Symmetry: C2
Subunit: 283 residues, 2 copies
């Protein structure tokens, strides 16, 4: 409970500077790429084979899978600069803004802006604009530049609200059988956003568009980690509020989705990361 992950809106210019710097270094080093691949690889690991469920989404392990993912990313960042921690994007507040693209999270000194429709929605502002930042497709090959198209779809014209975050936090069960895209009264499936979707998480990916718009390639965009830090935070909060509640399923769910099963592509299990304070950080 010593490294503290802050709200992006509360970062000092030098904090934003250092975060960007380090991710750039993590990118130059070839480490960042490992994270894009792990994500694409997990999505292709169906539990069980022939099912929608994959090691990282559309099932119970969604939350702990990405919590582990962020933990690893933060440690790698820390290896570069121990002063740096993963901030979180509180999109539910930006959603209150008239035009969310006005959020400081999209300023030229942090995440960069919306895509340029003159250049096929290629983002040309900020540290990650094309020419400074390389991207790779689902196949693992060069794709040619980050892309964004903020709220351009009929399905997700808006970012998720506070009420949405507050309504989800009211769910009494972590997840419910069958442990998938259809699970009812499920805080997990609710946060993932499949209920009358896209909501919350799925809705954020949809809103941003570009590579964030497709799960397998989402990580090419640094904001991805900031978005998942927010999701991880909302889950930490649920855990605090429901202390008699715990992870599910505990057993008899498909391999890779139970409390003590390994989470592909790793050996780490949901139990291993159930307690986030134990992981060394807080919000």
């Amino acid at each position: 409970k010593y490294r503290v992950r802050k709200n992006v809106l509360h970062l000092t210019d030098t904090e934003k500077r250092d975060f960007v710097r380090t991710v750039l270094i993590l990118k130059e080093k070839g480490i960042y790429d490992r994270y894009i691949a792990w994500h694409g690889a997990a999505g292709k690991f169906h539990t069980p084979p022939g099912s929608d469920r994959n090691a990282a989404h559309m099932s119970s392990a969604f939350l702990p899978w990405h919590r582990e993912y962020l933990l690893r990313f933060e440690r790698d960042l820390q290896s570069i600069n121990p002063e740096v921690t993963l901030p979180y994007w509180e999109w539910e507040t930006d959603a209150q803004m008239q035009d969310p693209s006005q959020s400081q999270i999209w300023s030229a000194d942090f995440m960069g802006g919306n895509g340029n429709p003159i250049k096929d929605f290629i983002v040309d502002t900020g540290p990650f604009a094309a020419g400074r930042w390389t991207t790779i497709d689902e196949q693992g090959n060069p794709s040619g530049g980050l892309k964004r198209n903020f709220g351009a779809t009929k399905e997700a014209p808006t970012l998720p609200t506070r009420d949405d975050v507050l309504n989800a936090l009211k769910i009494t069960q972590y997840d419910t059988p069958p442990w998938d895209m259809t699970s009812q009264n499920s805080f997990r499936n609710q946060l993932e956003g499949f209920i009358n979707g896209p909501q919350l998480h799925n809705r954020v990916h949809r809103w941003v568009g570009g590579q964030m718009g497709v799960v397998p390639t989402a990580p090419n965009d640094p904001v991805f980690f900031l978005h998942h830090a927010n999701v991880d935070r909302i889950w930490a909060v649920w855990q605090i509020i429901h202390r008699n509640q715990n992870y599910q399923p505990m057993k008899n769910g498909p391999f890779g989705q139970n409390f003590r099963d390994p989470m592909y592509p790793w050996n780490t299990t949901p139990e291993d990361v159930m307690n986030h304070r134990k992981l060394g950080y807080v919000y």
Copy 2:
């Protein structure tokens, strides 16, 4: 230097029943599938992006990546039955047989035989025959049927030889830049089989055919591990009789991690320290 990997031809009837038994349990548990995914996932991680190399093939990390891979698979086996270790298929000796498909490895109590051509070459005998063993396509989805087609191609109608092996063993340099398909005087590249390819490792895959014919789906066939065990052996010897140490593409150096894991080549340079010998 205590778990001992035996020649598949030196295995007893019970040791083979146990091995098979153990493999079917892994598949059963859902653990086996992790392996097919990891190998597949690796082929899509290029070092660097835009190049011909991937985390596990066509580059220096080819050998270290599969040794680690095999080390893990074996451990998962041990977990099920601590008596079971990973056997190896000495294909250079079967290359001498008039008809290698008669090799005991292909018996109905161990790996089953070459696919039945009338059934689209789907393996119809052995423990892993269609209906007894599920395979997964490249998309990670279900494909139904283990296939094999022994020596069916023009470029690979025969298994590598003792000489081919002996000649590989002669190579002095572990690997040479550019650290890829085109490396000359490279033990890594010779054994992988790109020199005058398809040879040795590359040749075995081409020979067996079926899922083994294509790298991404290769692990659906239990022999994959048996075959790679022999490769680790051939390398084990070379090491008795690494490069690039630095400056080669990230993911290939002596101290870089081997995607999708954190383990580095160094970590597995000395196989004995890993707890096994051949």
